Amino acid sequence: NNAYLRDGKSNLVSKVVELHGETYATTVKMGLSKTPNTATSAKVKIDAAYLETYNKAHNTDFALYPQDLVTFANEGILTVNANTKSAEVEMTIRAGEGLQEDKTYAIPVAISDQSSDITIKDEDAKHCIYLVKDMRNAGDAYKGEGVMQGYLFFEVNDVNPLNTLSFQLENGKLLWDVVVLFAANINYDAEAGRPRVQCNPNVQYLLDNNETLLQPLRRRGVKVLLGLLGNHDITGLAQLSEQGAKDFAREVAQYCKAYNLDGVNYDDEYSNSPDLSNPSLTNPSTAAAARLCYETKQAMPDKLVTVFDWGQMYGVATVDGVDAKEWIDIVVANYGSAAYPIGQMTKKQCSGISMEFNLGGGGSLSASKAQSMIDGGYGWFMGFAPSPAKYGSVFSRLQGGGEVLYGSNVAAPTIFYKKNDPTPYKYPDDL
Ligand SMILES: CC(=O)N[C@@H]1[C@@H](O)[C@H](O[C@@H]2O[C@H](CO[C@H]3O[C@H](CO[C@H]4O[C@H](CO)[C@@H](O)[C@H](O)[C@@H]4O[C@H]4O[C@H](CO)[C@@H](O)[C@H](O)[C@@H]4O)[C@@H](O)[C@H](O[C@H]4O[C@H](CO)[C@@H](O)[C@H](O)[C@@H]4O[C@H]4O[C@H](CO)[C@@H](O)[C@H](O)[C@@H]4O)[C@@H]3O)[C@@H](O)[C@H](O[C@H]3O[C@H](CO)[C@@H](O)[C@H](O)[C@@H]3O[C@H]3O[C@H](CO)[C@@H](O)[C@H](O)[C@@H]3O[C@H]3O[C@H](CO)[C@@H](O)[C@H](O)[C@@H]3O)[C@@H]2O)[C@@H](CO)O[C@H]1O
Ligand SMILES: [Ca+2]
């Protein structure tokens, strides 16, 4: 009887927990491959030694969440359920006064004292892990448990991402949970014969000026992602070999670490055919795209790995035996479509609408559409390329939906930002 451990609320082996209050309650669930017998038993425990193994495997440095803040019900004993081939125990995570903001802590949980009828294949199957972030002060985008969330791309060539702050509900909450700096590029470094991250001068300016133009968003609870995009040479996000994907994933994670960002969006577009003789490249395919997503999540497991569903970026649901739910946090679709889940993903990881704010296509976040997306179980609505000059049209496309999603409509904007300028100007007076 093979067993493994995962978070019961999410069914994820590796679960990022954002604390918005003093406690967070879930279950830890042991899955069994066969119906258990009357004597089958197991417990769970915090396994601090496994954190060293985990940090080494991922080249990360997460600190151990204070154990005194984590409590299991029932002495950590798993209640075995023969009918669902599983066993669970309640786990509570308390927010602590010794915690540092903008730091990820780890709770490695292990199966322990299991009965002799249970087989645990490896140390990965023995453990699940919670990656805990205290977000109590980064609350301004948090609109509630289980609500739909916003995902917004800025064309940073033209528009300052501080304009995220122009979008609030009437109750003062910020609309857009996640924003993308669209976009850094993948390009060939001919002199080195390898792919590299290549940043245009507009992208580079934001990174250089991260403290004033990007970190104020993160202070308010907005996740800031680096967009990655193909860029008219032999390299592309769906045509890296296994080694090329490992190398590029390491570079992307270094950008997110160096600049204190929250993850990436991958958009497989505008690349040319690869040079198949280059050991960093391979045939363009969803298998290569999935490999890159998987390797990027392994290099930054606490951060978001997200894809635009375009080109060959999305569709393979397993890499090295690991399901896509573990390494695709959000998938957003092309304007006019809804994203769909693969593997054990649900529609909570999918956009139900994508709105092209610059060209007009893709529909509106109306009361009717909001209700439709909730009824369908979608987790996200996506928008692309808003600009202060078009706020009239943009905000007309956000009426009614906020009342359905949050009990509070989107408010008319009163602030906007000019490119590369940190000053919140008055909208529309300063236009
Ligand atoms: C998610 C998601 O939505 N994903 C995608 C998303 O990508 C789409 O977004 C649009 O993408 C298209 C395509 O972008 C890519 O290609 C362009 C063009 O690349 C080619 O030309 C370059 C030379 O000019 C070459 O360097 C390059 O190799 C390509 O060459 C081929 O083709 C040319 C001929 O065109 C041949 O000569 C070549 O030989 C070869 O065949 C490219 O510019 C883009 O890359 C830039 O932007 C991305 C981010 O978007 C960055 O990551 C890149 O680093 C890069 O930026 C840097 O370089 C550029 C120069 O290329 C610098 O200007 C910049 O400062 C950086 O340094 C992509 O690779 C785009 O065309 C769309 O752009 C328009 O909209 C955006 C806003 O959304 C504007 O910011 C932008 O200015 C464009 O706006 C014009 O068009 C709009 C209508 O489409 C209109 O609303 C605007 O008002 C404006 O229109 C006015 O000007 C027009 C002339 O430009 C004029 O014709 C018109 O009448 C108006 O007067 C947009 O980004 C979206 C779309 O919904 O969906 C998905 O597909
Ligand atoms: Ca705060």
Q: For position 75, which CATH number holds?
A: 2.60.40.1740
At 380, phi and psi to the nearest 5? -140, 150
CA dist 18 and 131 (Å) reads 8
204 Cβ below 6 A of ligand 1: no
E-strand stretches of 214-369: 223-229, 263-267, 304-309, 318-319, 322-323, 330-333, 351-356
Technique used to solve these coordinates:
X-ray
Which residues are known to be catalytic? 269
Give the relative orientation of helices 286-299 and 242-258 as an angle to the nearest 10 degrees: 40
Structure-derived torsion over alpha carbons of residues 143, 144, 145, 151, reported in degrees to the nearest 10: 0
CA angle 97, 101, 102 (to 5 degrees): 155
User: In which domain, by residue range, is 130 found?
Assistant: 1-139
How many angstroms separate the alpha carbon of residue 272 from the centre of ligand 1?
Answer: 16
Give the amino acid at 213.
Answer: L
Cα angle 296, 300, 303; round to 5: 105
Tell me: do 268 and 328 sit in the same domain: yes
Atom of ligand 1 nearest to the CA of 265: 1
**CA distance from start to end of the chain:** 67
Tell me which ligand sits closest to the C-alpha of residue 185. Answer: 1
- Can you point out the beta strands (E) in 232-278? 263-267
Could you count the other beta carbons within 10 Å of the beta carbon of residue 32?
22
Pair 294, 152 in one domain: yes
Compute CA distances 113 → 39, 64, 168, 321, 327, whole Å: 13, 22, 50, 26, 30
Domain boundary among 139, 157, 179: 139
Tell me: cis bond preceding 42? Omega within 30 of 0 counts: no
Q: From CA 416, how far away is CA 153, in angstroms rounded?
A: 16
Question: From the alpha carbon of 180, which atom of ligand 1 is closest?
Answer: 1
Clarify whether residues 56 and 93 are in a common domain.
Answer: yes
Residue 222 gets which letter from DSSP?
-
Beta carbon of 233 within 6 Å of any ligand 1 atom: no
Last residue of a domain, one of 120, 139, 158: 139
Q: For 387-414, b where at least 16 C-beta lie within 10 A, e where not — what string?
A: bbeebeebbebbebbbebbbebbbbebe
* Residues 161 and 187 occupy one common structural domain: yes
Q: Whose CA is nearest to atom 16 of ligand 1?
A: 270
CB 249 within 8 A of CB 290: no
Q: Helix, strand or coil for residue 165?
A: helix
Q: In degrees to the nearest 10, what's the CA dihedral of 64, 65, 71, 76?
A: -20
Quote the number of domains for the chain: 2
Q: How many CB atoms are closer than 10 A to CB 249?
A: 23
Judged by phi (left if over 0) then psi (alpha if -120 to 50, else beta), residue 270 lies in left
Q: Identify which of 154, 156, 157, 355 to mutate to test ligand 1's pocket (most ligand atoms within 8 A of the CB).
A: 157
CA distance 297 to 327: 5
The resolution in Å comes to 2.0
Of 139, 169, 198, the last residue of a domain is: 139
Q: How far is the CA of 103 from the centre of ligand 2 (A)?
A: 16
In whole angstroms, give the CA distance from residue 318 to residue 345: 11
Helices (H) and strands (E) in the chain, counts: 10, 23
Q: Positive or negative CA dihedral for 397, 403, 406, 408?
A: positive
**Ligand 1 binding pocket includes 395 (Cβ within 6 Å):** no
If phi over 0 gives left and psi between -120 and 50 gives alpha, with beta otherwise, what is residue 329?
alpha
Beta strands per DSSP E along 246-303: 263-267
Residues in the 5 Å CB sphere of ion ligand 2: 137
Taking the CA of residue 202 as centre, how many other CA atoms within 13 Å lie in the half-sphere pointing to its CB? 16
Do 189 and 255 belong to one domain?
Answer: yes
Same structural domain for residues 290 and 420? Answer: yes
- Ligand 1 lined by 157 (C-beta under 6 Å): yes
**Which one, of 255, 236, 222, 219, lies nearest residue 154 by Cα?**
222
Residues 6+ positions from 45 with CB-CB distance below 8 Å: 76, 109, 110, 112
- Say how many Å lie between the CA of residue 311 and the centre of ligand 1: 17
Take atom 62 of ligand 1 and give the residue whose Cα is closest.
157
**Residue 267 in contact with ligand 1 by CB distance below 6 A:** yes
Q: What is the distance in A from the centroid of ligand 2 to the CA of 408?
A: 20
Regarding whether 67 and 129 lie in a shared domain, the answer is yes
Amino acid of residue 118 = I
| CA neighbor of 180 nearest in space, from 336, 377, 386 | 386
Ramachandran quadrant class, 320 (left: phi over 0; alpha: psi -120 to 50; beta: rest): left
User: CB–CB of 245/292 below 8 Å?
Assistant: yes
Q: What is each CA distance from 373 to 62, 362, 366, 379, in whole angstroms?
A: 36, 14, 10, 8
Strand segments, DSSP code E, in 300-388 are 304-309, 318-319, 322-323, 330-333, 351-356, 380-384
Please work out whether the CB of residue 217 comes within 6 Å of at least one atom of ligand 1.
no
Does 75 share its domain with 8? yes
| 230 CA from centroid of ligand 1 (Å) | 12
What is the C-alpha to C-alpha distance for residues 393 and 196, in angstroms, rounded to an integer? Answer: 38
CATH number at residue 319: 3.20.20.80
- Ligand of minimum distance to the alpha carbon of 140: 2
Q: Cα–Cα distance between 324 and 85 in angstroms, integer? A: 22
Q: Which residues partner with 151 through β-bridges?
A: 178, 382
CA torsion 268-270-273-278 (nearest 10°) is -70
Q: Are residues 12 and 161 in the same domain?
A: no
- Name the residue among 88, 9, 57 with its Cα closest to residue 320: 57
Task: Enumerate the H helices of 59-133 as residue ranges.
Answer: 123-126
| CB 183 near ligand 1, within 6 Å | yes
CA 361 to ligand 1: nearest atom: 111
Secondary structure E strands in 282-340: 304-309, 318-319, 322-323, 330-333
Same-domain status, 207 and 328:
yes
Atom of ligand 1 nearest to the CA of 183: 52
- Report how far apart, in Å, the C-alpha atoms of 219 and of each of 112, 139, 140, 210, 216 are: 39, 9, 9, 12, 5
| C-alpha to C-alpha distances, 335 to 223, 338, 377, 381, nearest whole angstrom | 22, 8, 19, 11
Same domain, 115 and 157: no
d(CA 33, CA 259): 43
Do 255 and 135 lie in one domain? The reply is: no
